[model samples]
Target: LALLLGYELPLTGANAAYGRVFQEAARLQLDRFNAAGGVGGRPVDILYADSRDDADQARTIARAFVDDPRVVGVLGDFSSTVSMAAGSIYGKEGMPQLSPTAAHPDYIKISPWQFRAITTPAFEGPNNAAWMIGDGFTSVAVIGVTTDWGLSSAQAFRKAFELRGGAVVVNEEVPPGNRRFDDVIDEIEDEAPQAIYLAMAYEDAAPFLRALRARGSALPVYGSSALYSPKFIDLGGPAVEGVRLATAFVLGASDPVVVEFVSAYETLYGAIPTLFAAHGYDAVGIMLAAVGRAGPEVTRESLRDALAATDRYAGVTGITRFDPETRETTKILTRLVVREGDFRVI
Candidate 1:
């Protein structure tokens, strides 16, 4: 019944906050399990690796884990770009990798061995598009990071927006890790879009918001789940006010499960849980349940089979029913708007 796992986390990069939160939650679960006499009388040991949000570093770490016979499964490189790069190696090695928070649409496309607890950009993009169109936004501008997650999500949003009768006037991809958005902001202002959809990470989204505000572009801004982190709110400050986006969980959601999970998370972390943290918790919970059911012979294949058997698994995010063909989870998304430094569900 012994099992060894590895976690590839961005412990010292733009996604450090998310990585810390996920690590803390996983540690909490591990502690609880150990206190309860461990799983099947065997303690699970997890090895940690820092990817630093670099694709090459992630690939190297994943290869090292794959080569280690004791490491049976791995939990992830948080961002989609890093995860996709690492996932390619995992696919070749037949290593079971479950990314707790990578939401890009193309991660699973890169490898079947890769799975995620969070909904993909495919879900978030259409959801955001529907929200924007429903709110009467007809002309919009799109901006995204050059990474696969940002670019693919932007494309999906563009398609969804146009299909819903909204015109995407300007679509631009900024270099990854670039915080300066002066040029992009100027271009977007020229387009005079009724709304601007940002498909960058929380780090980039903050500066993008500040730039737009500085330029006096008061038009409404929209974003993907990347804005779900506290960094966006803290960095963007009042500039992010009234921005709307599609996300998996809302602390104010009426669902009892979400309410309980948020309360527990706040109690544990002394702060509100972001979408990333919630996804991490859900991933651990789902994996633990599957492993418990699979018993002592919990091989990668068996764990995967257990995951595939999932149907209507109630989680903090939502009731997840994973599709076998796409390995995508079917979960309802909630619309959130930044209002007065808080994400208020719309």
Candidate 2:
């Protein structure tokens, strides 16, 4: 008997880069796991589906997997928005879908069958506030795009900031992809905040920094996990210098497990793996680990139960344990500052 699973990937669309890298890392872990006697001597095979970065397309693929009785579980659909779109279906059908990179604050709460390998905005938001407050910042201006990640993270940071005696001088919610920030910048100038907390996607975030620099606003900027990607710095260039963002793991960490993973991945792919690859590796590992614990007579319900009972499991990034109720981890997030065009841990 073979252990079968499904992987929803966005291989040919706006997020192709993410899907390609994540798939490679997942296969790498799969090869290693299979070579090491596999799960109870049953080899595993993960069927792949290209979701094409669309909610409807993702749901279509998800429905196919649900109808396939061989698929005991699933992993993927990288973005929070896409995963949330398909999560409800997986929950109602009693199949498990663990998104390696979906960090929207409310994703897990939306469905009991849904799970995630990364920390969401709910935790990252408050963590960012604490980091900024600890660095002696007395006030902040928040600029967020009208997206789930943006609005939720910004609101969490502001809530925590006000509680910690740091005043949020301005709260600005711009339209999604509203790149023309001349008016928004004018509002920030009037507020005159000591710092800026940017809750936005990288595409919108980079342009905001450039426009702020163009308009001569040099306030120190802070961001949540969304800005931790290399694409953010690559797009923002000099304007992104001195920006602070939250992170979970640094490739240069001295932990033996992390170092081993980084070395193995770089050697295999000739490139340093990002947080996506790390999370992807853990997503499959966690699902299989849970299935292994559920024994030979594994079913969708048993796997879901196993995932909910997930304990302190360590991976390349950090130790994560999904809350029994929310099935989301609220811990393991840290901070980094962009210095010399790289994410530097503070």
Candidate 3:
């Protein structure tokens, strides 16, 4: 009676770390679910496929998952870009796609069957703007790579920041994975703005921050969860300190659930769980919750109905509730600033 679930991720490429932890975290949660009498007397098995973070690869993988009727639901193919590319296939096939970290504002509009299980960039943009205005930064510079996550976040941040009475004097976009941000940094420094916001993947942001700090840019930096990775900290080291990133799962919360999750994740992952790991863990939990509610006859329709029926689910990340009309989910996000050489809620 094992329920087979389909999963897609970039096992290789810029987001490899995210996919690695995603696999392990999902596996851990599914193991726990099986131990608890399994889903309706049987476990749910995950069949993983690598999308390589490419649109063609993701679309192909989506087709494979949809062609296979045994697949209960589709979990991910990593970033918002890839997820949206593959989502069209799933939507046409009537397969529900549950994204743990896509976060794009219009992601759900891709399909009625698509459901997002985390905070979206729509809320994050306004939230970050509020933080900047509260911190007294009236003017700032914006810089990031040009990609789905980067472009959307930059636009959202700029719109929200301007709306909050803050001004963005300099807005720059570099090609994805460009290591030479020295010129970009110098341009922003010339702006001599009150602050700076980065809308980049961690891979690109790290070197940029390191170079920015080297050039004596002390202006505070704001970032979204795109920079919430150990690699980002490891790459930027002290340079990344004080950079603010938005997240739903924050460390240092006194809640026992957070403590327990950190301990278990450390035990299994050999280090503290990054943002994607927690997202992955909760993604599995959400999927399992829906599957269990769908009962033993877990068809695509029933599982989707179960998801719509989900009320307040207290996951390690936070409380998740999906709207029945839009099938979009929401959770409260917090600001995590790099402190003491690591990320902490600020």
Candidate 4:
């Protein structure tokens, strides 16, 4: 009998495009694991449930996964809000839940079952703040979604930017599904900050960038690692050019593991994978490693214990090690700019 893992991500909703990309990356990693004889020579497989990136949907999926005795672990719920909602159920059921890209600072605090390969905005936002300050930006305007992830990221950025003697002229929060940014752009432009910091996902950022470009606003835009996606470039087009961001995974890196992953991804998917894909690939690797270490007859608690014991796992996104007490990870971040329709480390 094959070992089962559950995946709860947006497969057919607003974030489905990103979800599909994540799934492809995870599938590639899982395929490689199964090829290598999987856990205890029993091929490992996943039961993917479309979360729609919704909290209620995620919770339902979590309950379903927990009810399935075959499901040893779960990975997903794209947004932090959804993930944490689902995580509460997993926590109660004593099932391990790992997110590929949920970055709300409070996510890990939800329960011991909650874990993430992605670093929280508390780390990344400060890194971006420092990067912008280094680039001679004394003032910035912040625009973000009103979601939990957005609020956390924006809050981290504001605190860090101000701490570094940078001024935040204006901070705007928009709905995550906001498409029109005319008024927001007008207001921010009137303030005339040295730069703009986007603390939202690529889906929201692209339209905002396009709107800013439409207004001929040449303000330098900086973003969190959340915007480091091929879809961002595709969505923002010329508007995304010169936009800078910091990501844990640099697609253009010469690291051997990254090289191998990028090459294989391009060959298989005909597209260069993004930070999300890297996280997805790494999440599978991390979970499988824990599953393997949990031994042949791995229980939910055993897998959770093994995951907590993860010290160092070298993957495409750099070394992933869950903290003993907090279960949070301190991952590497790379600064990138959208140069000629691609993300280049600068």
Clashes of each: 0, 0, 0, 0
lDDT by residue for model 1 over 91-178, one digit each (tens)? 8888878888887767878766778888866677777888888888999999888886687778888899889888988888888788
Better of 1 and 2 by TM-score: 2
Q: So what's the TM-score on candidate 4?
A: 0.72
21, model 2: CA deviation in Å? 2.7
TM-score for model 1?
Answer: 0.70
Model 2 bad stretches (over 4 Å)? 12-17, 51-69, 79-86, 103-110, 174-193, 201-220, 231-241, 249-255, 271-274
lDDT of 4 by residue, 25-57 (tens): 988999999999898798899999999888888
Q: Estimate each model's TM-score.
A: 0.70, 0.79, 0.74, 0.72
TM-score leaderboard ranking: 2, 3, 4, 1
Q: Point out the worst 10-residue segment of candidate 4 by lDDT.
A: 119-128
Please list the C-alpha lDDT of all candidates, in the order they appear: 0.80, 0.84, 0.82, 0.88
Model 4 ranges off by over 4 Å: 10-19, 40-42, 50-61, 132-151, 162-222, 226-243, 272-275, 338-341
Candidate 2 global lDDT? 0.84
Q: Which of the predicted structures, 3 or 4, would earn the higher TM-score when compared with the native? A: 3
Q: Write the per-residue lDDT of candidate 3 for residues 1-346, one digit (tens) a residue.
A: 4788898988899988889988988988898898897777877889999988899999999989988888979898678899999998888888988888887767789987787767775556677878889989999898867876677778888898899888999999889888787777777767788888888778888888888888888888898777887778898899999999877787555668776888888888798887778888888889888998887788998887887776788887877788878877776666688887888866
